[PDB]
Amino acid sequence: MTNVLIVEDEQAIRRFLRTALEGDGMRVFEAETLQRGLLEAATRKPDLIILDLGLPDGDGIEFIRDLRQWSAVPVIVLSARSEESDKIAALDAGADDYLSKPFGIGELQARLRVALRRHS
Amino acid sequence: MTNVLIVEDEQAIRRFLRTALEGDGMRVFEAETLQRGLLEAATRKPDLIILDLGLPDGDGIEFIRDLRQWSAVPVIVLSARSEESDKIAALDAGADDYLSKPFGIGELQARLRVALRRHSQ
């Protein structure tokens, strides 16, 4: 199946994304820390990762920088941080796309499709 | 020879981009109509296109639908149409990214970089 990993500390976000994604026909995995995010990324072979930056054990930008040393999987940042400067940093570190919260599930899922067509 | 095509009808935006994109050492080519745009895409062989949507000779979403039949060049739309369905439409048409005006140039440049790195692969 099309595998998606969500790295987000807040269940309400993770339930909401899963539902929408499982509704669109994707298998979904989860992680609620940065550290557990990296392990799941290396074990579940996700085709796409949705990343949150405000995580309790570190900033997700360190996740993107770790990840990109060993993986080229698409990464969409979904975060409360809305500064232009936050977006620039995360894209340059290696994220592929960035949506601030609050967001529209519709826009997400479409950007999800963009990221899944180009790399695969 | 990293080549950007800007297809945008208001001049001020076009030279705002050129000032920005020429500053990182790229080559920039302008088009003010959808027709002269589609054309430049097929001809100048650019590495990316920044695509306006509100054009005099038709809708940018048709620029994409058409393009995707003969080019795979990354497309980033830059348009004032700030609507969710507008974004979904353009993306589903084969746009790679979408930034609404008004916009920060820094973020447009970082998103341009994503499209270069992902398509050189």
Ligand code: BEF
């Ligand atoms: F905590 Be995440 F960056 F919204």
Ligand code: BEF
């Ligand atoms: F005219 Be563009 F869509 F801003």
Ligand SMILES: [Mg+2]
């Ligand atoms: Mg968080």
Ligand SMILES: [Mg+2]
């Ligand atoms: Mg216009």
